[PDB]
Amino acid sequence: NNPEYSSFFGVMGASSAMVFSAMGAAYGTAKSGTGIAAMSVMRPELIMKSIIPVVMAGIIAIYGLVVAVLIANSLTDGITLYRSFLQLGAGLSVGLSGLAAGFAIGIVGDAGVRGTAQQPRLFVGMILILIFAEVLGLYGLIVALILSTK
Amino acid sequence: NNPEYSSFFGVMGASSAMVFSAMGAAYGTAKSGTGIAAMSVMRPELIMKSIIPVVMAGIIAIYGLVVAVLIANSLTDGITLYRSFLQLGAGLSVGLSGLAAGFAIGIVGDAGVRGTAQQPRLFVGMILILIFAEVLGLYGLIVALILSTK
Amino acid sequence: NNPEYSSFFGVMGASSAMVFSAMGAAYGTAKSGTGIAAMSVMRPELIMKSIIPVVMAGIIAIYGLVVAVLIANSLTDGITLYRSFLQLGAGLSVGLSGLAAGFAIGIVGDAGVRGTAQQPRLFVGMILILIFAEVLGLYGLIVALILSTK
Amino acid sequence: NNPEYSSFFGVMGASSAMVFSAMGAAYGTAKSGTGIAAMSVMRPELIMKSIIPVVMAGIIAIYGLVVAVLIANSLTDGITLYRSFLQLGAGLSVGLSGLAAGFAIGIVGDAGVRGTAQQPRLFVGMILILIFAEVLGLYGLIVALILSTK
Amino acid sequence: NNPEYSSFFGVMGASSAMVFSAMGAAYGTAKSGTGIAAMSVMRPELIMKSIIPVVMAGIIAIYGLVVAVLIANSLTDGITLYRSFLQLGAGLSVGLSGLAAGFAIGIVGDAGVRGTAQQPRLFVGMILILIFAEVLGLYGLIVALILSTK
Amino acid sequence: NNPEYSSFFGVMGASSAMVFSAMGAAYGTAKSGTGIAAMSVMRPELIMKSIIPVVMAGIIAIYGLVVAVLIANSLTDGITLYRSFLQLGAGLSVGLSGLAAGFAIGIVGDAGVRGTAQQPRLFVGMILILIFAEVLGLYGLIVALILSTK
Amino acid sequence: NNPEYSSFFGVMGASSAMVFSAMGAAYGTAKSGTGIAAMSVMRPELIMKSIIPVVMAGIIAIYGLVVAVLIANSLTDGITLYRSFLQLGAGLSVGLSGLAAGFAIGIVGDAGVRGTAQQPRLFVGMILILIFAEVLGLYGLIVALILSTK
Amino acid sequence: NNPEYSSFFGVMGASSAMVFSAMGAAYGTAKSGTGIAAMSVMRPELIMKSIIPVVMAGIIAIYGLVVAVLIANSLTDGITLYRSFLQLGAGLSVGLSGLAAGFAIGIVGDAGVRGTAQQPRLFVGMILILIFAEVLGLYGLIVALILSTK
Amino acid sequence: NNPEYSSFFGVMGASSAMVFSAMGAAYGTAKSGTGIAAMSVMRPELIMKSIIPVVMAGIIAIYGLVVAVLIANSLTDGITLYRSFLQLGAGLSVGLSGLAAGFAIGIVGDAGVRGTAQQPRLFVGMILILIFAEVLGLYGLIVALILSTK
Amino acid sequence: IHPPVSYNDTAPRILFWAQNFSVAYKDEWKDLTSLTFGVENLNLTGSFWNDSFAMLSLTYEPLFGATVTFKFILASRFYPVSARYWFTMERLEIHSNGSVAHFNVSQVTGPSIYSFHCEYVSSLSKKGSLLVTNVPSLWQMTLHNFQIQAFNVTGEQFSYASDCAGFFSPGIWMGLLTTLFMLFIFTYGLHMILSLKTMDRFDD
Amino acid sequence: TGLELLYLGIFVAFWACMIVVGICYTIFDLGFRFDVAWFLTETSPFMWSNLGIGLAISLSVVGAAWGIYITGSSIIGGGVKAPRIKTKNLVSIIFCEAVAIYGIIMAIVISNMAEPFSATDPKAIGHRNYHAGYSMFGAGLTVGLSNLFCGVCVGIVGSGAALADAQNPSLFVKILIVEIFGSAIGLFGVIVAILQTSRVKMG
Amino acid sequence: PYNLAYKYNLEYSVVFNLVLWIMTGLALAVIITSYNIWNMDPGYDSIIYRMT
C-alpha cells in the first residue's frame, strides 16, 4: 500500500505554488509602487496609466493561486507518491517561475515608470517588456498544469 | 497507525500562520510608521489619511489569526497525518503569503506616504497599490482555508 | 505509553515564549530608548510623555510571561506528546509574534518620538501605530492560549 | 520493479528546467529593460530596436519550457531510475545553461543598448554578442534534448 | 532506570543560565562604560550617577547566578529526563531573557548617559527606561524559578 | 551488479560538462561585451575586430557541448559505477576548466579591448593572452575525452 | 560499567575552562593594551595607573586555570558520565562567563583609559565598572566550582 | 573483492588535478592580463616581454594536465581503494599547489608588469620572483607523480 | 583490549597543539613585525628592543611544540581511549590558549611598538602587558601538561 | 501478516520474521515462507538460548530430498566502550545430508534490547549480500524484510527496531568528505577568481 | 557582504542542523546510532593517509605562494623608486619557498609510510593500520597548516621589511630576525609531523 | 501487529543523500540567483539624482 507520508509533498506543492508566487507579486508590487510614488511627485497625471505594472505583478499571484487551488483540490489521503511528486514539481515550477517574473516585473516597472515620467514614448516599450517578463510566470503555469494534470 | 507525532505538523501550521503573518504585519507597520513620521514634520494634517497602510498591515495579521485559530480548533490528538500535513500547508500558505504582503505593504506605504506628503494626488494611487498588495495576503488566506478544510 | 522525551517540547515552548518575547521587548525598549534620549536633548518636557513606546514594549514581555507561566504550570511528567507539541506551538506563537510586535513597536517608537520632538501633532498618530503594532503580540497571545488550553 | 521515489528526480528535472530558465530570462529581461528605459529618456527612437535583447532573453524561457514539457510528457510512475536521472540531467543542463545565457544576455544587452544610444555603430556588434550569449541556451537545449529523449 | 544523558540537559541548564546572563550583563556593562567614558569628558560629576546602568546590568548576572545555583543544587545522578528538561528550560529562559535585558540596558544606558551629558532632566527617563528593560530579566527569572522548582 | 542508481554520476557529468562550460562562456561574453560597448563609443572601427574575445568565450561552450554529447551518447542503462564516475570526472574536468577559462577570457577581453582602444599595439598581445586563457578549456577537454572514452 | 567515552566531556570541560577564559583574557589585554598605548603617546605618567584593566583581564584567565586544574585532577578513566557532564558544564560556565567578562573588561578598559587621559575624575568610575565586569567572571567561577565539586 | 565505488576517488583525483590547476592558471592569466593591459598604454614596447607571467600560468595548467592524464590512464575498473586514494592524494597535491602558485604568479606578475614600465631594472626581479612562485606548482607535480606512481 | 580508533584523538591532540600554537605564533610575529618594520623607518634605533614581542610570540610556538612532542611520544597505536581524550584535551588547551595569547601579543606588540616609537616611556608598560598576554600561553601549557601527563 | 517464529523457553525467547524466506540449492530456488511462518508443526528442535548466546535451528524435512537445517547463530555481550549489551548474528549454518555450509553475516548488529530489521538479508550480490562465504558454496538464501530478536524479548512483540538502512554508509562518508575537501578548495579558488577586478581607467 | 553571506549561511545552517540532530539523537535514545567508532573505523585508513600527504604538500604551497605574493608585491612596488630592493629583499622569497620545501620533504616522507593491506574487516585491519592512517593525517594537517601560517607570517614580515628597506638600506639586516623567528614555526611543524609518524607502519 | 519494524529499504543511504544534496544544490542555486536578481543594480541611477 502507498506510504502514509505521501501527501506531504503534494501539500508542499500547493503551499509553495502560493507562497513563492505571492513573494514574486509582492516584490513586483513593491518596486512598481515605489516607482509610481517617485514618478507622481513630478508627473501626477501618469499615476493611473502607471499602475499597469502592479496589475501584471498581481497576475503572478493569481497564477500561484490557480495552481495552489488546483493541487489542493487534487490532494487525497491515498495520494500515490508519484502524484505527490508531480504536485510538488508543478507547485515549484509555477511558484519560482512566478518569483522570477515578479523580479522582472518589479525592476522593469520601476525603471520604466520613472523613465515614462521623463519621456512619454517609453510607455509602449515598457508594456512590451513587462509582457515579456510576465510570460515567464505564464510558462511556469503551463509547466505546472502539464505536470499536475499528468 | 496514525503515528504519535502526527500533530506536530498541524501545530507548526498554526504557529506559522500566526508568526509569519505577524512578522508581515510588523514590517508593514514599521516601514509605514517610519514613513508617516518622516512625512508629518511638514504635513501634519495627512497623518490620519496616511495611517491606512498600518491598517492593511494589521489586516494581514488578522488573516493569520483567522487561519491560526482555525488550525488550532481543527487539531486533535488522533489527527491523521494527512490532515496534519494539510494544516501545515495552510499555515505556511497564509503565513508566508502574509509576510510577502506585509513587505509589499510596508514598502508601498513608506514610499507612497512620503510622496503624498509632496503630491496629494498620489493618495488614491497608493490606495489601489495597497489593495493589490493586501490581495496577496487574501490569496494566501484562500489557499489556507482550502487546505485546512480539505 | 507516553515517550519519556515528551516534556522537552513543553519546556522549549515555555523557554521560547519567554526568550523570544523578551528579545522583542528588549529591542523595542532599546530603540525607544535611543529615540527618547535623542529627542530629549532639545525637548525635555516630552521625556515622560514619550515613555509610551517602552510601556507597549513591556506589555509584549508580559504576554510572554503569561504564556510561559501557563505552559510551565501545565507541564507534568507524563505529558502526552501531542499536548507537548501544543505547548511548543503556543510558546512559539506568542514568542515570535511578540518579537515581531517588538520590532514594530521599537521602530515606530523611535520614528514617532523623533517626529514628536519636531511636530507635536504626531503623538496621537504614533500611539495609533503603536496600538496596531501591539495587537500583533496580542494575536500571538490569543493563538498561544488557544493552543495551550486545547 | 522500479523504486517509488524514482519520479522525484524527473519532476525536479522538469521544475528545474523551467525555474532556472525562467530566472535567466527574468534577469535578461530586467537588466535589458532598465537599459532600454534609461536609453529612452534621450533616444526614444531606439526603443523598438533595443527591445531585441528582451526577445533573446525570452527565447531562453521558451527553451526551458520546451525541455520541461518534454520531461513532463515523458514522466510516469514506473519511470525507471535511469530515465529519471536522464530527465534530471536534461532539466539541469537546459535550466542552468539558460540561466547563464540569460545573465549574459542581460549584461550585454544593457551595455549594448546604452552604448548604441551614444554610438549607433555598436548595434551590429551587440547583435553578434547577443547571439553568442544566446547560443549557450541552444547548447543547453541540445544536451537536454539528447538526455531527455534518450 | 533513568537515562544517563539526562544530566547533560541539566548541566546545560546551569551553564546556559550563567553564561548567557553573564553575556547580557557584559554587553550592558560594556555599552554603559563606553557611554560613561564619552560623557565624562564634558561633565565629570555625572560619572558616579551614570553607573546605575552598570548596576542594573550586573543584576542580570545575579539572576543568572541564582538560577544556575538552583539548577546545580538540583542536579543529582538519577534525575528524571523530565526534570532535566525543566532545568534546561529554566536555564535558557533566565539566560537568554537576561541577554535581551542586557542588550536593552546597554543601548538605553549608553544613549541615556550621553543625553544626560547635555540635558540633565533625561536622567529620570533613563532610569525608568532602564527599569522597563531590566524587568525582562526578572520575567526570565520568574519563569526559570517556576520551571526549576517544579 | 551495476547498482540501479549508477547512471546518476554519468548524467551529472553530462550536466556539468554543459552547465559549467555555459557559465564560463556566459561570463566571458558578458564581461567582454561590456568592454566592447565601452570601447565602441570612442573607437567605432574597432568593434568588429574586437569580437575575438567573445568568439573565444563561445568556443568554451563548444568544448562543453562536445563532452556533454559524448557522455550523453555513452550512457547505457546498466552502466558500471566505474564508467559513471569516469563520466562525472570528464564532465567536471571540462565544465569547471571551461569556467576558469571563461573567467580568464572575460577579464582579459575586457581589459585588452578597453586598452586596445587606447593603444592599437595591444591587440596582438591580447590575442596571445586570450589563447593562453583559452587552452585551459582545451586541457579540460583533453582530460575529459580521455576519461569519457576510457 | 560506565562508558569509556564518558571522559570526553570532562576533558572538554577542562579544555573550555582554559581556552575560553584565555580568549576572554586575551581580548581584555589586547583592547586595553591598544588603549594604554594610544593614551601613553600623550600622558606617559598614567601608564601604571592604567594597567589595571590588563590585570583584571588576567584574573579571568586565572579563574579559567583554577577550574581547569580542578577538572583535570577530577578526571579518571572510570569517571561516571554524570560527573563528566558536571565537568563540561563547569568548564563552559567558567570559560564563556570569563569570555563575557573579558569582552566587558576590554571595551571598558580601552574607553576608560582613553577618557582618563582626558578626564582624571573618570578613573574611579572606570575602576568600578571594571569591578562589575570582573564579577561576571567571578560568578562563572562560583557556578563552575559548585558543579565541579558536587 | 574491492568495493564497487573504489574508482571514484581516483576519478576525483584526475578531475581535481585539472580543475584546480585550470583555476590557478586562469587567475594568473587574468591578473597578468590586467597588468599588461594597463602597462601597454604607456609603454607599448614591453608587451611581449611582459607576457611571461601568462606563460608561467600556462605552465601551471600543464602541470595539472600531466597529473590528470597520468591518473586517467591509471584508472582501471578493479582499481584497489589504495591506488584510488593515492591518486586522490596526487590530484589534490597538484591541484591545490597549482592553484596557489597560479595566484602568486598572477599577483606578482601584475605588480611586476606594472613596475617594469616605471623601472625597467625590475624585469629580472619580477622573473626571479615568478620562477620561485612556479617551482611551487612544480613541487606539487613532483609529489603528485610520486603518489600516482607509487 | 583498547579500541581500534582510540589513537585518533591523541593524533588530533598533537595536531591541534601544533597547528593552533603555530597560528598564534604566526599572527603574533606577523602583526608585531609589520608594526616593527613600519616603525623602523621613523626610529631605526628601537628595533632590537622592539624584537621582544616577536620573541614572546615565538614562545607560544615553543609551548605548542613541547605539548605536541609530549603527546606524540606518549601516543602509541593502542592507547586507552581515556588517555586519547586526555591528549586531545591537552592539545586543544595548549593550542587555542596559545592562539589567544598570540592574538594578544600581536595586537599589544603592534600598538606598543608604534607608541614607543612615539613615546619611549611606554616601553616598560608594553613589556608588562606583553607578559600578561604571554602568560595565557603558559596557563594553556600548564593545563596541557596536567592533562597529558595524568 | 504471518506470525513470527517464536522459540519459547518458559517464555518467548527468539522471535524471527521474514516477509519472504527463500533458499536455493544448485540454483533450485524454493520458497519456505509458508513452510516456516504460521505452521504449528515447525521443527525447531535443537534450538538453544543461553543468557548470552542464541541459536534458532529451523528444520524442513522433504526439502531437496533431505531434512535440511538452518541454524541462525547470534551472540550478545557487553562492549565496554558503552554500557550496552550489543548483539550480533555471528553466522548462519546450513546442515544438509551429511555436511555443513557456513555463511558469515556481515552487518546484523544492534543493542540487545532492540530487534534488528533489514530488507533483504540475502547472499545475492543484487540484494546486499549481508550473508557471505569466502569458499564457493552450493546454497543461496534470501530473507526479504528480515527481522530478528534473540535477547531481551518481551512476549510476542519485537522491541524497537534498529536496522542497516542508515542515513550514511562508509562509501558515502568517504565520498562526502573527499567532496567536502574539494569544495573547500574550489570555494577558495572561486572566491579568489570572483574577487578579480579590472581597471576602470587607462593612462594617457 | 556578498559571498561571506553565503559562507555564513552555510555554516550557521549546518551547525543549527547539527545541534538539532544531536539533541534529537540524544533525546530519542538513538545515541547508539551515532557511531563515531564506526565512522572512524570503516572510513578507510587510506583516505586519512592520502589526505594527510595531499594536505601536507598543498597547504604548505598555499603558504609559500601566499607569502611570496604578499612580499613580492611590496618588493616590486618599493623597487619602482628604489631598485636596490630587488636583489636584497629576495631573502624573504627564499624563506617563503623553504616552507614549500618542508612541504614536499614531509609529503614524500609520509607517502613512504603507506602500504597496502589486503584486509577489510576492521579487526583484521587492526590498531596499527588505523593508527598509521590517523597519524599520517595528523602529520599532514600539522605540517601543512603550520607551514601555511608560517609562510603567511614570513610574507607579511618580508613585505614590511622590503618597505622599510625602501627608505633606509641599513634596516633590512635587522628586520630579518623577525622573518627568522616566523620561519622557525615551519620547522616546529615539521618536527611534530616527524614525531607523529615516528612509529607508523601500514601493512 | 507484533510491533514489526518499518520496512526501510536497503538503498536508504543512497536515496537520502541523492535527495538531500540535489535539493541543497538546487536551493542554493535558487537563493543565489534570486539574490543576484534582487540586488541587481536597478539601472535607473541615471534618473535617481533628480528623484532624490
Coordinates of N, CA, C and O in Angstrom, one line a residue, chain A residues 57-97:
Chain A
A57 N 2.0 42.3 -12.0 CA 2.6 41.6 -10.9 C 1.5 40.8 -10.2 O 1.8 39.7 -9.8
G58 N 0.3 41.3 -10.0 CA -0.7 40.6 -9.4 C -1.1 39.4 -10.2 O -1.6 38.4 -9.6
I59 N -1.0 39.4 -11.5 CA -1.2 38.2 -12.3 C -0.5 37.0 -11.8 O -0.9 35.9 -11.8
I60 N 0.8 37.3 -11.3 CA 1.6 36.2 -10.9 C 1.0 35.5 -9.6 O 1.0 34.3 -9.5
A61 N 0.5 36.4 -8.7 CA -0.1 35.8 -7.5 C -1.4 35.1 -7.9 O -1.7 34.0 -7.3
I62 N -2.1 35.5 -8.9 CA -3.3 34.8 -9.4 C -2.9 33.4 -10.0 O -3.6 32.4 -9.8
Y63 N -1.7 33.4 -10.7 CA -1.3 32.1 -11.2 C -0.9 31.2 -10.1 O -1.3 30.0 -10.1
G64 N -0.2 31.7 -9.1 CA 0.1 30.8 -7.9 C -1.2 30.3 -7.3 O -1.2 29.2 -6.8
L65 N -2.2 31.2 -7.2 CA -3.5 30.8 -6.6 C -4.1 29.7 -7.4 O -4.7 28.7 -6.9
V66 N -4.1 29.8 -8.7 CA -4.7 28.8 -9.6 C -4.0 27.5 -9.3 O -4.7 26.5 -9.1
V67 N -2.7 27.4 -9.4 CA -2.0 26.1 -9.2 C -2.3 25.6 -7.8 O -2.5 24.4 -7.6
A68 N -2.2 26.5 -6.8 CA -2.4 26.1 -5.4 C -3.8 25.5 -5.2 O -3.9 24.4 -4.6
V69 N -4.8 26.1 -5.7 CA -6.2 25.6 -5.6 C -6.3 24.3 -6.3 O -7.0 23.4 -5.8
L70 N -5.8 24.2 -7.5 CA -5.9 23.0 -8.3 C -5.2 21.8 -7.6 O -5.8 20.8 -7.4
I71 N -4.0 22.0 -7.0 CA -3.3 21.0 -6.3 C -4.1 20.6 -5.0 O -4.3 19.4 -4.7
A72 N -4.6 21.6 -4.3 CA -5.3 21.4 -3.1 C -6.6 20.6 -3.3 O -6.9 19.6 -2.6
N73 N -7.3 20.9 -4.4 CA -8.5 20.1 -4.7 C -8.1 18.7 -5.3 O -8.9 17.8 -5.3
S74 N -6.9 18.5 -5.8 CA -6.4 17.2 -6.3 C -5.9 16.4 -5.2 O -5.7 15.2 -5.4
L75 N -5.6 16.9 -4.0 CA -5.0 16.1 -2.9 C -6.0 15.1 -2.4 O -7.2 15.3 -2.4
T76 N -5.4 13.9 -1.9 CA -6.2 12.9 -1.3 C -5.4 12.2 -0.2 O -4.2 12.3 -0.2
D77 N -6.1 11.4 0.6 CA -5.3 10.7 1.7 C -4.5 9.6 1.0 O -3.3 9.5 1.4
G78 N -5.0 8.9 0.1 CA -4.3 7.8 -0.5 C -3.5 8.2 -1.8 O -3.2 7.4 -2.6
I79 N -3.1 9.5 -1.8 CA -2.3 10.0 -3.0 C -1.1 9.2 -3.1 O -0.3 9.0 -2.2
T80 N -0.9 8.7 -4.3 CA 0.3 7.9 -4.6 C 1.5 8.9 -4.5 O 1.4 10.1 -4.8
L81 N 2.7 8.3 -4.2 CA 3.9 9.1 -4.0 C 4.3 9.8 -5.3 O 4.8 10.9 -5.4
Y82 N 4.0 9.1 -6.5 CA 4.2 9.7 -7.8 C 3.4 10.9 -8.0 O 3.9 12.0 -8.5
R83 N 2.1 10.9 -7.7 CA 1.3 12.0 -7.8 C 1.7 13.1 -6.8 O 1.7 14.3 -7.2
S84 N 2.1 12.8 -5.6 CA 2.7 13.8 -4.7 C 3.9 14.5 -5.3 O 4.0 15.7 -5.2
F85 N 4.8 13.7 -5.9 CA 5.9 14.4 -6.6 C 5.5 15.3 -7.8 O 6.0 16.3 -7.9
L86 N 4.5 14.8 -8.6 CA 4.1 15.6 -9.6 C 3.5 17.0 -9.1 O 3.8 18.0 -9.7
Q87 N 2.7 16.9 -8.0 CA 2.2 18.1 -7.5 C 3.2 19.0 -6.9 O 3.2 20.2 -7.1
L88 N 4.2 18.5 -6.2 CA 5.3 19.3 -5.7 C 6.1 20.0 -6.9 O 6.4 21.1 -6.8
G89 N 6.4 19.2 -7.9 CA 7.1 19.7 -9.1 C 6.3 20.9 -9.7 O 6.8 21.9 -10.1
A90 N 5.0 20.7 -9.9 CA 4.2 21.7 -10.5 C 4.1 22.9 -9.6 O 4.2 24.1 -10.1
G91 N 4.0 22.7 -8.3 CA 4.0 23.8 -7.4 C 5.2 24.7 -7.4 O 5.1 25.9 -7.5
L92 N 6.4 24.0 -7.4 CA 7.6 24.8 -7.5 C 7.8 25.4 -8.9 O 8.2 26.6 -9.0
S93 N 7.4 24.7 -10.0 CA 7.6 25.2 -11.3 C 6.8 26.5 -11.5 O 7.2 27.4 -12.3
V94 N 5.6 26.6 -10.9 CA 4.8 27.8 -11.0 C 5.3 28.8 -10.0 O 5.5 30.0 -10.3
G95 N 5.6 28.4 -8.8 CA 5.9 29.4 -7.7 C 7.2 30.1 -8.0 O 7.3 31.4 -7.9
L96 N 8.3 29.4 -8.4 CA 9.6 30.0 -8.6 C 9.7 30.7 -9.9 O 10.3 31.8 -10.1
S97 N 9.0 30.2 -11.0 CA 8.9 31.0 -12.2 C 8.1 32.3 -12.0 O 8.5 33.3 -12.6

